């Protein structure tokens, strides 16, 4: 609805609060399916899997 995080999809009020949080997703496989909890390494990987739900 506003400033969504690219990895876990959680939305934040401002872009300030978003990158305060975006530093939390540091890991070897950072993108999370907002339905499974399945984790992926690239944004596209998550996109394909997300659209198979």
């Amino acid at each position: 609805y506003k400033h969504k995080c690219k990895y876990c999809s959680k939305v934040f009020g401002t872009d300030s609060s978003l990158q305060i949080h975006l530093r939390s997703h540091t890991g070897e496989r950072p993108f999370v399916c907002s339905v499974c909890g399945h984790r992926f390494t690239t944004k596209g990987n998550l996109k394909v899997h997300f659209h198979r739900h």
Partner: protein, 346 residues
């Protein structure tokens, strides 16, 4: 409670993708303001909105009114998140769904009536034995007397008593509730409704069935027909397969058990507002695990979850749970999502 056969215009929340059965509860999490203000205006007038039962695309032909009974605001991280619980009420067939400027589509629906039928013997019962139609109620020799006395007057028709028992509501539930006691050890005879209408609808929301069977029961109006169709599913569809590849058996009915007080299949919600009817089973087959167990937002406290997928088509079927302490039993079980399953007849 709307009127019967009447027409009403009822708002429709566009995020909902769930076939709601009367009496079943629908949990929701809403971030968008249009829908948040939509819930707030409902909690004043009627509290009811319409939940369409999708065939999917956007093709819906029946649905159910849903009534808000719970409401909680969390204003965390600068974003107003509203969690609201609804309960399904009356069935309807859709007439026109006019989509409105803000987004919420309005629906002209015809409120479906509930077909109540008299006993199958009320037509033939001899007036001299009306005086005997009330029994001192509850064993399986007891059920042998109930049939010999309730259907004594079958001797005046061209059918026996045992056929009439197969359309007797009271008999159908005792048979249905026999098998629910197999899925739930925490299940007392009083935990189940006594009305045949409400009882069929509760069983409708409890069975792990795909949308097609879930819709088919909604189209059924007489409770007798609902109960028999439900008892039929329970008996024939012993096996549960991957709804995607359709030939991969994930688990069977012998493995269904109840982990929480809420039964063998309750609606859980994940951190981002997705609802999962999660059937808890002992053993499961043809599943690949993904990742290492995590405890974040674990629906069953004390257990760590792990994503599970079909070995064949790689679809999402559910999660494997493991005990994080050691004194707990089961030390392991699987939470299977209902949208992923397809009951089958071996």
């Amino acid at each position: 409670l709307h009127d019967d056969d009447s027409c009403q215009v009822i708002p429709v929340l566009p995020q909902v993708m769930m076939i709601l059965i009367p009496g079943q509860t629908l949990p929701l999490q809403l971030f968008h303001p249009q829908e948040v203000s939509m819930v707030r205006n409902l909690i004043q007038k009627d509290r009811t909105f319409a939940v369409l039962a999708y065939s999917q695309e956007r093709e819906a032909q029946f649905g159910t009114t849903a009534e808000i009974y719970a409401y909680r605001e969390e204003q965390d991280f600068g974003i107003e998140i509203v969690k609201v619980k609804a309960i399904g009420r009356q069935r309807f067939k859709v007439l026109e769904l006019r989509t409105q400027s803000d987004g919420i589509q309005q629906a002209k629906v015809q409120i479906l009536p509930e077909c109540v039928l008299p006993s199958t013997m009320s037509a033939v019962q001899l007036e001299s034995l009306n005086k005997c139609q009330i029994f001192p109620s509850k064993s399986y020799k007891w059920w042998q007397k109930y049939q010999k006395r309730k259907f004594h007057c079958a001797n005046l028709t061209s059918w026996p008593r045992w056929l009439y028992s197969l359309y007797d509501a009271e008999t159908l539930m005792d048979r249905i509730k026999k098998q629910l006691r197999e899925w739930d050890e925490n299940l007392k005879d009083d935990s189940l409704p006594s009305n045949p209408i409400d009882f069929s609808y509760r069983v409708a929301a409890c069975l792990p069935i795909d949308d097609v069977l879930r819709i088919q029961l909604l189209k059924i109006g007489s409770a007798i027909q609902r109960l028999r169709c439900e008892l039929d599913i329970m008996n024939k569809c012993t096996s549960l397969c991957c709804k995607q590849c359709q030939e991969t058996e994930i688990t069977t009915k012998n493995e269904i058990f109840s982990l929480s007080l809420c039964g063998p299949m309750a609606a859980y919600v994940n951190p981002h507002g997705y609802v999962h009817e999660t059937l808890t089973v002992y053993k499961a087959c043809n599943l690949n695990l993904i990742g290492r167990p995590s405890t974040e937002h674990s629906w069953f406290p004390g257990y760590a979850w792990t994503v599970a997928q079909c070995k064949i088509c790689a679809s999402h079927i559910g999660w494997k749970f493991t005990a994080t302490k050691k004194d707990m039993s089961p030390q392991k079980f699987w939470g299977l999502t209902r949208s992923a399953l397809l009951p089958t007849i071996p």
